[PDB]
Write a protein that binds this ligand. Sequence first.
Ligand SMILES: [Zn+2]
Ligand SMILES: [Zn+2]
Ligand SMILES: [Zn+2]
Lengths: 638, 176, 47, 115, 59, 101, 177, 100
Amino acid sequence: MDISKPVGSEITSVDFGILTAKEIRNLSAKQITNPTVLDNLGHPVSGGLYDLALGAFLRNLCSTCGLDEKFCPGHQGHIELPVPCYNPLFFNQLYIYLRASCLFCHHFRLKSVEVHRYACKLRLLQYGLIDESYKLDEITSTLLNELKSKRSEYVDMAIAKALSDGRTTERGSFTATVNDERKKLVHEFHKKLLSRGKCDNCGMFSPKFRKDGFTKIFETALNEKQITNNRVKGSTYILSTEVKNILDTVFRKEQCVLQYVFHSRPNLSRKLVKADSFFMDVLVVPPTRFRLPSENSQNQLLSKVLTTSLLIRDLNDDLSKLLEDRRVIFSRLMNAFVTIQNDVNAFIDSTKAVPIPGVKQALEKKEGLFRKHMMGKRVNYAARSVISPDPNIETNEIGVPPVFAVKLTYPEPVTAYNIAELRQAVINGPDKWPGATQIQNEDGSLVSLIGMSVEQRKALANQLLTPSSNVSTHTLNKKVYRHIKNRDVVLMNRQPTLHKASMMGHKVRVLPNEKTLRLHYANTGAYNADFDGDEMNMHFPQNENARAEALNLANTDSQYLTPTSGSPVRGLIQDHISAGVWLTSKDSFFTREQYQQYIYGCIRPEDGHTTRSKIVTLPPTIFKPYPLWTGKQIITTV
Amino acid sequence: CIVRVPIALYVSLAPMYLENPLQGVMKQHLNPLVMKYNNKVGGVVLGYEGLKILDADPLSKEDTSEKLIKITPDTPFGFTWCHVNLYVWQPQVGDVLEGYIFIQSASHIGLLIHDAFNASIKKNNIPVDWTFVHNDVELGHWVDSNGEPIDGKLRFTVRNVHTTGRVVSVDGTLIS
Amino acid sequence: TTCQFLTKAVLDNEREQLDSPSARIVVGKLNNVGTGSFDVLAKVPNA
Amino acid sequence: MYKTEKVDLALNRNRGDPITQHFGFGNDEWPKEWLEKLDEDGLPYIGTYVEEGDPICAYFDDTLNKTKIKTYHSSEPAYIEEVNLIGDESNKFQELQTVSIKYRIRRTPQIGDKF
Amino acid sequence: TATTLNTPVVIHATQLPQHVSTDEVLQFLESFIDEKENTNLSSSISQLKRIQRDFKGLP
Amino acid sequence: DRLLNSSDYTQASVCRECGSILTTQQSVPRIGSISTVCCRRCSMRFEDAKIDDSQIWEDGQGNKFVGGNETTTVAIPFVLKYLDSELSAMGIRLRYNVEPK
Amino acid sequence: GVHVSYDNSIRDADGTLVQFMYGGDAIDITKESHMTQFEFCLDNYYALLKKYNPSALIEHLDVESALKYSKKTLKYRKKHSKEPHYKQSVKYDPVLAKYNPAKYLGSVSENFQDKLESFLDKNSKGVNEKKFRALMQLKYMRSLINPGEAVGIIASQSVGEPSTQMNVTLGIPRLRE
Amino acid sequence: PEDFQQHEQIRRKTLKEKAIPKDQRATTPYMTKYERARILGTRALQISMNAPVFVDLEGETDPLRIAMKELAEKKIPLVIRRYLPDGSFEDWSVEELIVD
Ligand SMILES: [Zn+2]
Ligand SMILES: [Zn+2]
Ligand SMILES: [Zn+2]
């Protein structure tokens, strides 16, 4: 992040949705069709997974935006599936709505006056009307047209009453406790929807379905005991085009109910919810940037989709050519319906179809994506080394070696006050402390100082503070990536960081010789850090916002009292406690020379410790035969 | 056909213009915008009048000198909404423009509109009866329907507006 | 169980206001606790 | 500390295909910068000081006509102590493809060392 | 070019435009020129004075 | 600073009516033109749109079509852009709506 | 996301409310170790008055109003407490749940109001009896927890980290259940 | 022109509805430990980016030590917008707030 390159727009909200098939045809760059990735001569095949329309690839320009590898953002493509297949993210809920629906009127089998009740209770819960949904149950062929009026009139009455009495915006109120009553009510809805015998509108049965797991679907044999209601009314692997040819007609008759089942927030967009939303007629391939070879496993899963996709296209050529051939071509085409289903199952979910890791298993657990790369990240401008104990350091500081002080760097924008100490720093160069490793120019340029001699490097010290040559950059200034000085700030951090005082903000103080981090003894009570080869992380913040927090807020002097009990966790440990039993003895007497040497050896006014600009002393305890100072009187004047 | 648009613009503001904030909106976002083409305005922005920063806190009067600017959390640049009245010269099709002759060639008629803006009239827009005389010395002229060389104004109608390059261009026919 | 909560989010068409610190590191906002619990507004002198 | 790594020019081939990679220098324009490390047989000198970036063997490649090298992939400077010629047993006596190189590293007792 | 330091983030239109005559344009171009004269736009002041002379008199 | 500014900070470009990170892209300009940032999802083909010469842009394919210019650059982590690519393969659309519209 | 709000009312990140005040008094654990050490502070009255400087804080705060309600409840509670807690029509909120303690001086917790007036009753010692109670009521107010504190992390880092040193169940399986 | 005109007057009517006036604000009058560090941090980003400084520089080259010097004489021109969990806010300038 550069503090001189801002950003105008910020994300306010996100909302989860489903790609329809019209979008990802208009969204796409170029549809790809053959299940080969790259042919001979090293160049990828056009029409395959690695394609120059999906992004730049291995010193070859993008066929969509015309940018090289360092600047092409990557582009998504789509592959066509000949049959609408199931989405394994939604088969657990598709089979709920695949069941619980009569196959004749294409309503649900539960009665339409009570399906109207859940559509009125879940409308009130979209708004902040958790109370009035229980008052709705108190509202109780001709009277059902008026009962469905009285319930719907009360819902419309209670919304406009609450929306005018400053209580709930038309965006709806959605707290935690209305998410409780909503999930409880939809579980109540889906429970007694499935447990139905006959449709209460057209009073007859419907053949029950069987879930084989994933990848398949089966209907069962309708019993001879209850086929008689199917005559006085006036097993088979069914297709995935036969499932959609019901659930389209189901989700049209009952739009007013699933408009509020599938929406937590009130639907101001008025998008109709569809049964195509549960299938996926068109896969989306990720861009070629996100599936570069290690080939890659997502190119292997998409290969078997496209390998099946040409078999099932060639199997449909014989269906245009046509009885013995018609029998065998269709019991083998239907074998290809399960396999192209089983591929897009194994593409998304490797556990619902040893195996190739799918798209879901790049997200789920630890060593995944949310916990391995979003909540926790590898960081820049950071360091790690073994700590060794160190007195003589002022208890809010860290001792950084020269091997750390040369690599780690900080962007100082040049001003009137910098150009005395930051001109000298840019003369010293990358391999001298305190130095500088780069200069970031006004126009976002970057001039590395490593391969420069002392004459060119002193020349850029005078180009450093110049008025800008451009109107478009007339308000910016150059940033010198200087070395870390003794005024910078550092986050020291020892694992396991079990409490917040195990990650503190220290000042810095370089050491000129030795190659290890050095920590004062009053910090080992907080980090749980004995010095038996333990190492700990050092983080160097890169802007003035984070410098002002690891000095004032996450400072190590702020963290004297732990918040567990309120007790102090900072103090001296082994030799200082034994020395103070000897120094504060009654036997300890010090002469005039030994007294004044112990006081200056710990105060040192030139390092900003005393408050008087002159070390004041006490009269001695004993005056004659010769003056002596007791050790109680050392710590008094200290 | 100079028209007036009142706009609203969400701009940045650097800390060197924290003592003179109306100056900083002019020198960063408005003075690089005069004599250019802007898409959401409609045509070529000539100038502006009446720059007023919309204050952050709405409890302040319009008479107040001090106003609040919402600083970016990351960077020290501040953001604000402003109202200003741009004046913009916009060409549209079917309109008649006064021209000044700059190029007399056998391919196009490159002329200037209001001494600043380029324009052209193509060969296929020029009809059959308007022939061209050659100049072996130095650039001739198109002999009109009545036999006289053209000079001064040339009132044509707009065919298409071409703002894609550096400057605006106006395509035009020579019929009624 | 990321995709069990992902499908319960997308079937509910769930919009979130990015309030939790977990959702302000996924999308990169400033955290609403401590230092991001307020805005800083500069007083500029002229109109 | 005595570290040993085996440089083998035969772990990309099988079944009698000819040795495309020979030890030593060929006849192209290879840079004479590294005569300070390597001998005329491609193999480094005994006792020389090697840090990160120095070549430890020189070999000529036949499909590229380019005497490439192999560099010392360790950030701790060493000294080449012994260089062996592992000859492979065959009836048709093969030119060498296997050389083991041994280093030594001065572990002077630094701070942080555990006694 | 093309940075938030140069362009506004989002540019809008508050109200519909209505056309003005030469008296409004010349009074603007004797105030916008005056308060800017009394920098890349120093070459753009000349291109405004090329328009200022075409609505008053003759070049 | 640790979780965004010094790991994978990026000022990616976002559409304001799609709210999608990995859609919009640099247009291939003409000779002397400028490469603007422009959206693929909420655009329309030029064979489909029966225009004002400035809303019209072109791919590198040779496909020139007129559409979404409502776009802006928003500072995100880069790992969010990979989260969208792993979810849009499943068929999950993430609409990142931005505040100045 | 659980944090102290600006109502001194700790709540979740999405706005839903956990406690109406942090622990019942909203004082910081790292600012309360000497808050009831009353005899330490009487020995250091002229030193603590320099670090709070009460004369430079009268112009912004309401010194007098919360001390009127501080006696309407103290005299009420001593007159009661002869009965147990199912009978008590308490007639009054405590002085802390009605006035904001960060702004109103004297709006303290009931244990601090009792332990001050029990300390200041027993022993009797240039600082008098009423210059000292007007300093503990200001030491209390600076000991208020700051709005914005990440409480739910701190409360849950103060239970997991003491579990590192670890006829009924006991220990880390008891915290497990 | 008509849509953005309605979009803007709604957006400025809520932000006035969320505004709490100056004599009706009831949060703390102390600048907290969280407000203090960001005032020092955001001002020091401005001083490093050539903002006009309201204090005599006694050879201070650290921008965070200059902002700690502007905070002593109460010269920092910033305003804290203390948000309430309703979405409403209160505007406190740094000069009104007292430290420690
Ligand atoms: Zn591309
Ligand atoms: Zn039925
Ligand atoms: Zn779009």
